[PDB]
Design a protein around this ligand. Structure first.
Ligand SMILES: CC(C)(C)C(=O)OCC(C)(C)[C@@H](O)C(=O)NCCC(=O)NCCO
Ligand SMILES: CC(C)(C)C(=O)OCC(C)(C)[C@@H](O)C(=O)NCCC(=O)NCCO
Ligand code: NA
Lengths: 391, 390, 392, 391
């Protein structure tokens, strides 16, 4: 039976919408995190067989941004590279697909994760037939391909409203969660707890280079009071807001995968062993519920009980969905997103899953936690989870 | 573990802005997913996941593979995703699904690709705003589909790079291009695309239309019409519109499950996937990709090139295809025996699935035991897969 | 003494169908041909022109001051001046009045005035300086936004036409009859050769070959009442205004060469007529189709003429509804109005149309020996313009 | 012989490109100016017969923005309104066209001037035929329709270079002229000499309203070094720079006209009598020279010697051309642009002629100057000039 480990991991800092990485292509963030995982494990880029990168918004970035990130990071032309999209779950799914390359004896060494620049996502219009008369729409690919449900036509925060309404979650419980997430994240940030996992990214300029190594979306000094001031963002009589939903963000995150025997040959002390993963579908109207069956399915594959977990990363798309998952699964809230979650840190879609996985792995190392789980809800109604055990 | 293609279908390939000009990728996809399941006698609710290659999803809305999956009646309980190894995606998707089943993560996968090159939008990054001066609206089909990221030239320059390395004449490529069209029109009229094709109904306020014939194929392709073309990518070059593939829309897919499961279901499978591989090569000469990827596939399959009874070798260009034939040295009589992509079309993300459909349906038709399918990929890669009939 | 300005010569292009003969012909190219024509027809050299004044509503993307481009192409010397203006549909006729003014005030002696438009070449646009930080945005059709949508109510000109239909209680059958009659008069005029004199042929250059355009391509031959009756209302589901009883989207240019009556006489020119009066008046934007009514009345007052004194009238047909309303109110003999058909048939190249219908008026007055004529048009945003012309 | 007076005048402050009026439609600036001239004259909007506004870049603003300005200002629906374009000359030419309406007996009271929002000018593409395959250009209407010569394809700054070379104008002379403009305009602004002309414009905003009543393009404390440091903008061995050229700017300006008799009936002390005007063509290659023949012709028509002039506003498109004009005409530089010119104040194309007219009229009144001239050069090779006498 195969046994495949995460030798090393790294992520950029998460940028704010049109913030520090306003003009930085996804593959540029990508390339930095690929070299980082390689440098962090002591493996030469020339030893990478394949690079697999989750990416949702690749339009106008040119052929196969995954190969562009690979090549820029000095992975040789002889390797291969590709991109995939299971939306919010992409960056974590790519890690599982990579494990599969190795488990099936198709590859010995894989870099997998996700990259996303929501800033650089273009506006678009189908224009071949030509517009003989009348206005036409220039469509925001970020919104269209990222945040709009393809079946109901409404946005993801409307699905959060559905989940909020199902689980009867008050504005106050969602806001209390929100401020909790920010507070946890600003603590982690100041306490230095993101330094291990973040690789500085340098933003080249004519005016001068700017090194980015801090998560800029975290609100310092978030108060309940500030939270309670905001209007509902998707339903005039709704409870979801910009304060209790994640944001629009840019980042990359990756992990270096290989067999347990290989890490041991190379003297690598891996960050974890992938014991299981799972993906499952649910109603797109309540996609926030995804992590409930996916986590349960991952745990079933891992042969674990929910109580076995020492650390969880359950992605925070919206406070409504996040509370609901925590409610349903019944895991100790104190072990969930202990350094804050996406509401504070941001949600760079295709990278999110590799982002939270990074956070899980380094905090597991940090606390000496043995068993851990990452899970995300996925637009269109899915969830993905992955179980990790320390070596 | 032993994973078989239970069934397989593809849409006809449409010419650029032709039959499918205003058809979303995911609708062509939904037709192919349903057709695989119907042909296999498998309930859609039995499907674990749908994996679709697609290179050009801008404007089409969240995760078009799931939109196809849902439009095909696969329940909300299944999963779906898209992937891009450019021209390899459609075949890579099938490898990826086989892995899902090999690792015990799924029982039944629908894998393939879908593309609408006609529906690809123009785009510009516009958040920062253009404070003054002109800007370019970018054809995402060209940028994200056929333009090499590293050198910034089209895929037709690479083919010229390969024409000049393998020293392939303009005569030879026209000999190849006419030969391809002839086979495709022969095969078409002969009724050899019927099995693999599932018809697609294009809905309209003027009337529905049923597309069930490949429309990019030229009838009565003469060398003259080839030799009358000017070079498209270099003023002194040998690559042309006639000895290169087209821009196209279409979809293709396979139903995967274990061999054991196919036997519980009493399904007579189209083939057993014996091996596959992907490999990298100089992006400048990307069309060579099928060489290392077919050799690895074959080494991984424990086969010799002399073992193959049939090969499908994607003709992105005549120069890259001739060169692969030249180096691999297989019998050119068993290669693309019903024509190729120059004749048929190259719907980027579907193409690997396309050429698999053709490979599998013709191995049945003539009773070939072994087949290899292979593609070159923008940026310099090759994918290949080895299919043994049951 | 009170100045007397004549129209020494006039010309127009054939009017092109939307995305038709002139699909890719910039407006100033049409204009250049027409400027060349009026000079030729008057025996006046381009070197003698003082100013060119061209109405033009949709100049976006054509570059700096397309009037000047038209003039320079036509060989008008760099020492002359040229400018464009925009009083919407009224533009081409107002230009002619503004030309007259230049001469009357002693600032010029010889002016080419009229208008030009390429609706087909009108671009789509969007303001993108500040970025679109998130969310979809519209690429606006400049033709629709700047030419055909009311700026105050936000609806299209055809809704204003519905408004007039309703106020004047004009039936669908009445409007349809008017529109068929327009088509049939224009077809008849065309087949008889009555537009030859006014039309200067336009050569559309290509690579595949040149094509000479000298027929109005929008006129429907053999137009049937059934063809009109079958159409759905285009602006109100329970309305009466249709694509068939409205004018179209068209390309074209048209112009007149002006000079003092004394200067014409020196040169030995037999002018097409004397400008005796003009006027422009405003009305409610909601019923802008009504502009011709006060504009005409004022023009006549200023001329010292009664409605009954008119021998010919060109009253522009933006829509059958407003056309009918104007004729009903003014009470002029419909048999003297748009005798060669009107815009429903011929087309409506916005900034050119006033000069176009002036062309038609002048050449018909000449043809039939009519002494007194009037040209009038309604104007988007609630205005009218009218000019009175007398034979000399 | 008819005698037409300018009863009153007003202008907006001139905004910087994408500055104070970045999102203000030209017709909103024009309305405020229309309301102002009416206020200043004591004439009610009900009395206005026609509004005539020069405007070079109306694309996307809707039907006949002149009418939109007139209606917003309360000018009755029975009045009429129209736009015109003779490029830079347009605001001034509008005033002459107004004059003509009165002189020929067609109107009694006219508001004429110009308005321009270079900021709001869109980008455009002809898309009716479709673009079957390949990239296409989105054209900046501001550059295309406002600033590029239609015959030679180069920008107006290249015309200014042509004039530099022909008149042998050093980069030092041009920089000195531009510094002097800035320093004159700063002085005038600090002394309050633009207050009388400027009508404040309220920029409405959710986050509050902003009152704009100072010319924001004027550089305070402009140094010769700052000019000397600049690279030539139009030819690598050129002399014309962003510093010795005017800018891209927003604004409106207008004058209310009536007959001298009508003003006397109303008891109005007018800003000046229109004594003459002229417009002439020159080679487009050297369009900056237009003022030369235009001014000479206007002076001839007025029966005035250049020496007779007490004040001159000669528009400063570029230092090069402004210097050539002054050299040729020979008028005392100390009477020209005494409060600075466009290089400092800005160049809102279709309003600029009316702007400089405003500045002339208010300074003539201020200093008791009897005879004034306003002149501008015009893209495509023309000039326009106007002679004004105090009453
Ligand atoms: C008003 C417009 C042009 C947006 C529209 O509704 O579609 C236009 C059609 C399809 C009705 C077309 O037949 C048409 O051009 N109708 C006339 C439009 C129009 O207002 N023309 C100018 C009349 O003054
Ligand atoms: C002239 C233009 C706009 C094409 C250009 O060179 O870029 C703009 C800059 C930023 C370089 C700068 O020189 C500028 O603002 N130019 C505009 C100069 C101009 O035409 N001014 C009008 C003078 O009346
Ligand atoms: Na505003």
């Amino acid at each position: 039976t195969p046994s495949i480990v995460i030798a090393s991991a790294a992520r950029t800092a998460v940028g704010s919408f049109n913030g520090a990485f306003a003009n930085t292509p996804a593959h540029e963030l990508g390339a930095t995190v690929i070299s980082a995982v390689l440098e962090r494990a002591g493996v030469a880029a020339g030893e990478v067989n394949e690079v697999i990168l989750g990416q949702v918004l690749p339009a106008g970035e040119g052929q196969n941004p995954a190969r562009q990130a690979a090549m820029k990071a000095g992975v040789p032309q002889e390797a291969t590279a590709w991109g995939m999209n299971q939306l919010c779950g992409s960056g974590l799914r790519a890690v599982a697909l990579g494990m599969q390359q190795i488990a099936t004896g198709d590859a010995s060494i894989i870099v997998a994760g996700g990259m996303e620049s929501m800033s650089m996502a273009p506006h678009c219009a189908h224009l071949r037939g030509g517009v003989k008369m009348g206005d036409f729409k220039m469509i925001d690919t970020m919104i269209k391909d990222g945040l709009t449900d393809a079946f109901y036509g409404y946005h993801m925060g409307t699905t959060a409203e559905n989940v909020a309404k199902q689980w009867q979650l008050s504005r106050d419980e969602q806001d209390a969660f929100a401020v909790a997430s920010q507070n946890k994240a600003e603590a982690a940030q100041k306490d230095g707890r993101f330094k291990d996992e973040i690789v500085p990214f340098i933003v080249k300029g004519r005016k001068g280079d700017i090194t980015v190594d801090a998560d800029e979306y975290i609100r310092h000094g978030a108060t309940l009071d500030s939270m309670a001031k905001l209007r509902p963002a998707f339903d005039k009589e709704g409870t979801v807001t910009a304060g209790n939903a994640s944001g629009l963000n840019d980042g990359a995150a990756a992990a270096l995968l290989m067999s347990e025997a290989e890490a041991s040959r190379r003297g690598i002390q891996p960050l974890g062993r992938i014991v299981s993963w799972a993906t499952v579908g649910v109603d797109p109207k309540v996609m926030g519920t995804g992590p409930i069956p996916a986590s349960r399915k991952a745990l079933e594959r891992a042969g674990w009980k929910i109580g076995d977990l020492d650390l969880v990363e359950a992605n925070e798309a919206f406070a409504a969905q996040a509370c609901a998952v925590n409610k349903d699964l019944g895991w100790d809230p104190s072990i969930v997103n202990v350094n804050g979650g996406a509401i504070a840190i941001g949600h760079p879609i295709g990278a999110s899953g590799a982002r939270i996985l990074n956070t899980l792995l380094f905090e597991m190392k940090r606390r000496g936690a043995r068993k851990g789980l990452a899970t995300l809800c996925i637009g269109g109604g899915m969830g993905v989870a992955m179980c990790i055990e320390s070596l």
